[PDB]
Amino acid sequence: EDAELLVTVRGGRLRGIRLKTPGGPVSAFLGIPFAEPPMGPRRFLPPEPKQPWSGVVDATTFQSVCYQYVDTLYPGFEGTEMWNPNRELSEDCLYLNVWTPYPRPTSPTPVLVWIYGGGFYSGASSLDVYDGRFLVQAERTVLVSMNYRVGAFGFLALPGSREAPGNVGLLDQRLALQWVQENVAAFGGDPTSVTLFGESAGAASVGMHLLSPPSRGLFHRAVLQSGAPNGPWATVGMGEARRRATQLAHLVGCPPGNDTELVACLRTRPAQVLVNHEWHVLPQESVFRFSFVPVVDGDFLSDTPEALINAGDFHGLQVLVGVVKDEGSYFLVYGAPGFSKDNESLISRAEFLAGVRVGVPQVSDLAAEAVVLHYTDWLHPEDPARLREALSDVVGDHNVVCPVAQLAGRLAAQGARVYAYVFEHRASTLSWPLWMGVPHGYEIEFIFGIPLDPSRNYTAEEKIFAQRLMRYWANFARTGDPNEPAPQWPPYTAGAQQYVSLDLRPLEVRRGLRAQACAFWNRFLPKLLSA
Amino acid sequence: REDAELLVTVRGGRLRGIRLKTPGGPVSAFLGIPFAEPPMGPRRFLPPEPKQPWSGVVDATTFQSVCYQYVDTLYPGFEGTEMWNPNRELSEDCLYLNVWTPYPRPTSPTPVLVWIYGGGFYSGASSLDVYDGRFLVQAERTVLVSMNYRVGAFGFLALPGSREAPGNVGLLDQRLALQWVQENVAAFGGDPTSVTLFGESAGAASVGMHLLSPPSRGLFHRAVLQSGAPNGPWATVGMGEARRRATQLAHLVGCPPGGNDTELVACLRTRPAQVLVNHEWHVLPQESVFRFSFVPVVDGDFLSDTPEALINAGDFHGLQVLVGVVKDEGSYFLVYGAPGFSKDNESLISRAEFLAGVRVGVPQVSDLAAEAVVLHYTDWLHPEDPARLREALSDVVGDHNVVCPVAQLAGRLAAQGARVYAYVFEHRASTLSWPLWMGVPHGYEIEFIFGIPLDPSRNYTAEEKIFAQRLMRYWANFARTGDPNEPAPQWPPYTAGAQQYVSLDLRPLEVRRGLRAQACAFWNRFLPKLLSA
Numbered sequence A: 001e002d003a004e005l006l007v008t009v010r011g012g013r014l015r016g017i018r019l020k021t022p023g024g025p026v027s028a029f030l031g032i033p034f035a036e037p038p039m040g041p042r043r044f045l046p047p048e049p050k051q052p053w054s055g056v057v058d059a060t061t062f063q064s065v066c067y068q069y070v071d072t073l074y075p076g077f078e079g080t081e082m083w084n085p086n087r088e089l090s091e092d093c094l095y096l097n098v099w100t101p102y103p104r105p106t107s108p109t110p111v112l113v114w115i116y117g118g119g120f121y122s123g124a125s126s127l128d129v130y131d132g133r134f135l136v137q138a139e140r141t142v143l144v145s146m147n148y149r150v151g152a153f154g155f156l157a158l159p160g161s162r163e164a165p166g167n168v169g170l171l172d173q174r175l176a177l178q179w180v181q182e183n184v185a186a187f188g189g190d191p192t193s194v195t196l197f198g199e200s201a202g203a204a205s206v207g208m209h210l211l212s213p214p215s216r217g218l219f220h221r222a223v224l225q226s227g228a229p230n231g232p233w234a235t236v237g238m239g240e241a242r243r244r245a246t247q248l249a250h251l252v253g254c255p256p257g258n259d260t261e262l263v264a265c266l267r268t269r270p271a272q273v274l275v276n277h278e279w280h281v282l283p284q285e286s287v288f289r290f291s292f293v294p295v296v297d298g299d300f301l302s303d304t305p306e307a308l309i310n311a312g313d314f315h316g317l318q319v320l321v322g323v324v325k326d327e328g329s330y331f332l333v334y335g336a337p338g339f340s341k342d343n344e345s346l347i348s349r350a351e352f353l354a355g356v357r358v359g360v361p362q363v364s365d366l367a368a369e370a371v372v373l374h375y376t377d378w379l380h381p382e383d384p385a386r387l388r389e390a391l392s393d394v395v396g397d398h399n400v401v402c403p404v405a406q407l408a409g410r411l412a413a414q415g416a417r418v419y420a421y422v423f424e425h426r427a428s429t430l431s432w433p434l435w436m437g438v439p440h441g442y443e444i445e446f447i448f449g450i451p452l453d454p455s456r457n458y459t460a461e462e463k464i465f466a467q468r469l470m471r472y473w474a475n476f477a478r479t480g481d482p483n484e485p486a487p488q489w490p491p492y493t494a495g496a497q498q499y500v501s502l503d504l505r506p507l508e509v510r511r512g513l514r515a516q517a518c519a520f521w522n523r524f525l526p527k528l529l530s531a
Numbered sequence B: 001r002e003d004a005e006l007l008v009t010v011r012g013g014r015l016r017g018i019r020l021k022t023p024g025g026p027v028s029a030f031l032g033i034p035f036a037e038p039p040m041g042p043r044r045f046l047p048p049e050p051k052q053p054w055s056g057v058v059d060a061t062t063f064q065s066v067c068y069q070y071v072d073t074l075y076p077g078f079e080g081t082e083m084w085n086p087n088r089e090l091s092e093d094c095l096y097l098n099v100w101t102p103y104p105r106p107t108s109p110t111p112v113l114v115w116i117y118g119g120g121f122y123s124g125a126s127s128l129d130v131y132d133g134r135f136l137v138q139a140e141r142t143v144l145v146s147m148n149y150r151v152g153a154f155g156f157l158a159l160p161g162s163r164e165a166p167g168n169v170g171l172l173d174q175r176l177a178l179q180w181v182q183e184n185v186a187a188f189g190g191d192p193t194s195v196t197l198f199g200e201s202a203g204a205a206s207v208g209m210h211l212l213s214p215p216s217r218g219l220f221h222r223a224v225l226q227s228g229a230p231n232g233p234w235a236t237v238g239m240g241e242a243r244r245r246a247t248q249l250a251h252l253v254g255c256p257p258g259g260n261d262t263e264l265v266a267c268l269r270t271r272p273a274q275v276l277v278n279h280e281w282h283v284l285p286q287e288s289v290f291r292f293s294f295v296p297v298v299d300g301d302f303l304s305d306t307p308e309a310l311i312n313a314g315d316f317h318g319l320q321v322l323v324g325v326v327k328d329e330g331s332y333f334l335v336y337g338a339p340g341f342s343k344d345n346e347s348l349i350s351r352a353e354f355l356a357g358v359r360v361g362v363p364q365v366s367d368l369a370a371e372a373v374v375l376h377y378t379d380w381l382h383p384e385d386p387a388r389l390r391e392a393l394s395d396v397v398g399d400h401n402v403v404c405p406v407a408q409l410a411g412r413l414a415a416q417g418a419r420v421y422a423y424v425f426e427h428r429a430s431t432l433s434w435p436l437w438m439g440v441p442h443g444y445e446i447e448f449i450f451g452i453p454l455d456p457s458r459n460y461t462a463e464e465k466i467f468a469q470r471l472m473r474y475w476a477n478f479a480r481t482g483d484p485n486e487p488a489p490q491w492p493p494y495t496a497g498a499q500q501y502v503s504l505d506l507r508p509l510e511v512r513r514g515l516r517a518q519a520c521a522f523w524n525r526f527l528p529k530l531l532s533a
């Protein structure tokens, strides 16, 4: 029997599996339990470390996906099904995965830790696009990814209560990071060189461990793709979190009042029941808003991410951040009037103004008017093509680009070394319509080297392009610098605001992550709402 | 003996004019015709009364006195400022008008242009060399009229509701002159059924107020508004603020030693005119540029409502309007207060000076409103570039005070039945004395519209003389027909959708879209909603 696939961690013995790659084999240990199953009385509770086991845990297959909604907008469509659960749903879902070179490294290898996105309501470490076999073979790193609770199971909060303190999905992530510190050396990984990287809610999640001291000692570098902890969707206040949690209880037949009896009744309901009602607790119609997200309650986050970002000292931190070219387009088909993947989505002026209230929810009429002013071309006020692109910019700037730009500028101006990118290559295999451009999430398959899979239809230059990106990411993980020692990728600074475009052409350096648009979102609009 | 062409009988009595030499030929001029009783002593602050008939012949042979007004002293002896200063003695006895007509007098009736000078409602005179009407009349065979009207406190001090200082008497001076034109211009060969008002800055704002005041609307048929509009934030003032200023002015000159409005103005009538001028600026509520102490007051009589409300609710079918701006409306005003600005250096301001300049250029807005201005006019990839900041502040002052008010007016009139033509004047005169960074400053299209480059004593280029002749032909092309186009690039009308205008310079006409559309959307659509909330 292959001794390379047998590992002893602190909890007991594991049996892995060898995987094939166009470049040779890698070792994979999938479905490693890192917590006790958060079932029954453990629902809504912080995770507890997995108790030691006898015998050999079978770590040859992905474990269950945490209970979550399944997208039904375009049934059977590749563009949406690639994000849906590809394993059975269960609350018994707190498992993690380790990929390492074959044979296992004998000297400490830098570790990449992947945190998936999905708006804190969905996601799984087992999706094909997160397959960690190509990056590990090509770049000789250890790759870890974990499952964490999403939706109500991960982020329902009755602030102050002990039965539902909130943020337990983030504590799932932290527990996995502690697991990496204690056990990754058994796989050949270096616990003193851990780089977190995540996308969308995963990137926001990464932002959060940076701003939470108990997590800060568990990693060394960070990569935030198309997400930030200061996004208007990534956190919720204590009052709004309580209201959302109490309405969910009402919608599923639970009282009132008292917090203890409410959580007890919620613990009696099948997981699928909470999933089916979780979306009817949002205060208004919206895109890019999610019911149960991290709560700012003074514990995991002692203050708002913005407050912590502005006050933090980030000397000694290296971060890689970036966005895709069209962050907003993907979200518009989930509620913006007139949008659909199956026509040109050439909306009218009335639909554009309607879409602004959906894309910028819960703001005063004056704030909405301000948005319409900045994103209108008053020489072509009614052109459908520009209106379609304008609303995509509104959603993309408000939710992704400008939060990321704000984060990058504050970190750089306060001690961090920041590298910024814009991913501008539209994959030849992309199934979404052409008007969506380079949509949210479609840089991930290149970061993980999925184009190297010969079973897929990517072009030759797209394979080289994926190899470039894997090299950038792994360089950063190894040294805090993506550059290969062209042209050079310069650091992002608050003044010069330099970033690079990532596509098939060599690196091009540009200035300003939508500087004009983001001055509105990050400088003016906050002052208007507070007055 | 006498020349019959220079003798004219008008309702008040008989007049004797003079015969002007121009390069192209002779012109008959009747300069200094009294149209009102002198507004002096007990008649100060009061509406004008028509000039009583006279026996004998009144010699209308030279410009009469300039209405009492402040004299600019920022750059003493400087050509660029002295050209606007009084060129006749100051006096309260100043209600006189001027008539230019071809020589010989027209056989058939001739359309009439009526000039209203600008000067922020505190200054100006029809006698300025750059308002010389002899060239337009000789070149285009038009009849041209201009009148003096009271400015400053003498024309616009208002204690609303009172009988002695009802306000807007300077506008009533203009209206009285317009009524004089209707009754008497035919004696000069002028057509009272074809009268086109034209004016610049406060004169353009005056023109617009006559459009919006029904008693004036029947006195003319077309309008030209150059670098000004009645809806500009400087052109009117509320009844309470007008009262506050009038009361503070009186307080600063010893009146009363508020209370009864009569005793207050009666005390004001005893003050020397210069004493009122010397204290007139101390009543402005803040340090600012482009705001003037005594301006028309929105009091329900001359203006039944605010100019914006009247513009929005007006029906303008049967009306032709010609509006426009210069290329750099804001630069001229920045040297009168904006920190870091001077005509003698490049005025490359710092960002701190830019932020300070915003409060001076956009006075009395909330801190939130000021930051909205800073957001829209800052290049966030070059936030501290001095040259960009200088240009930005110039745009900040021009759009807010001139360009966007004109655009709002042009758009509303076009959509509500009027035919609009719009221009941007983009030629910098070869003789301009202001520095290069000011570009094409406020007020420097006037000399080309009046054909001043044809003056033999001035060293304009031959190309600029052709340009002046073309511009003189466009307005006349409008006063005659309502259309600046000829009986040849064509000049299209301005509409709220396409928003087309033409550039006026040495090149042929070029059609462009949008009078700073993105910027004026902020001033005309958004910021009013913020000041309300």
Ligand SMILES: *[C@@H]1O[C@H](CO[C@@H]2O[C@@H](C)[C@@H](O)[C@@H](O)[C@@H]2O)[C@@H](O[C@@H]2O[C@H](CO)[C@@H](O)[C@H](O)[C@H]2NC(C)=O)[C@H](O)[C@H]1NC(C)=O
Pocket: A335, A336, A337, A338, A339, A340, A342, A343, A344, A345, A346
């Ligand atoms: C493009 O489609 C949207 C959505 O319509 C759906 O998708 C279409 C491709 C087709 O499959 C329809 O049967 C689907 O309903 C259109 O927006 C809708 O328009 C209808 C009226 O036709 C209206 O009742 C719905 O409320 C609209 N829904 C949304 C989300 O806007 C849109 O008009 C289409 N635009 C075109 C034809 O270019």
Ligand SMILES: *[C@@H]1O[C@H](CO[C@@H]2O[C@@H](C)[C@@H](O)[C@@H](O)[C@@H]2O)[C@@H](O[C@@H]2O[C@H](CO)[C@@H](O)[C@H](O)[C@H]2NC(C)=O)[C@H](O)[C@H]1NC(C)=O
Pocket: B337, B338, B339, B340, B341, B342, B344, B345, B346, B347, B348
């Ligand atoms: C440019 O000049 C302005 C105004 O100063 C005037 O013009 C100068 C050329 C010179 O003739 C001065 O004597 C004039 O007073 C400068 O701004 C002023 O600077 C002075 C001295 O620091 C200060 O006392 C005033 O308050 C300033 N006034 C303003 C309008 O801000 C400006 O600093 C000069 N910039 C240059 C040329 O670098």
Ligand SMILES: NC(=O)c1cc[n+](COC[n+]2ccccc2/C=N/O)cc1
Pocket: A069, A071, A121, A275, A276, A277, A278, A279, A286, A287, A288, A289, A290, A330, A331, A334
């Ligand atoms: N639990 C639910 O019913 C539910 C319903 C809808 N969504 C939103 O999924 C649609 N969606 C899918 C992908 C990306 C964005 C979006 C919408 N964002 O607002 C989540 C959960």
Ligand SMILES: NC(=O)c1cc[n+](COC[n+]2ccccc2/C=N/O)cc1
Pocket: B070, B072, B122, B277, B278, B279, B280, B281, B288, B289, B290, B291, B292, B332, B333, B336
């Ligand atoms: N009465 C006065 O002392 C007085 C002072 C200054 N001004 C204005 O003269 C300065 N100025 C002259 C020309 C153009 C603009 C400006 C300033 N605008 O705010 C008028 C009256």
Ligand SMILES: *[C@@H]1O[C@H](CO)[C@@H](O)[C@H](O)[C@H]1NC(C)=O
Pocket: A456, A457
């Ligand atoms: C993409 O791959 C699929 C495999 O199922 C194949 O059927 C299809 O023909 C490929 N597309 C192209 C354009 O070759």
Ligand SMILES: *[C@@H]1O[C@H](CO)[C@@H](O)[C@H](O)[C@H]1NC(C)=O
Pocket: B260, B261, B262, B263
């Ligand atoms: C002001 O006082 C005069 C007497 O000097 C008086 O005739 C007049 O009635 C008073 N004002 C008003 C508005 O009555």
Ligand SMILES: *[C@@H]1O[C@H](CO)[C@@H](O)[C@H](O)[C@H]1NC(C)=O
Pocket: B457, B458, B459
């Ligand atoms: C220019 O004009 C001035 C006065 O306007 C005059 O004195 C002078 O003779 C003219 N020509 C030159 C070369 O200065």
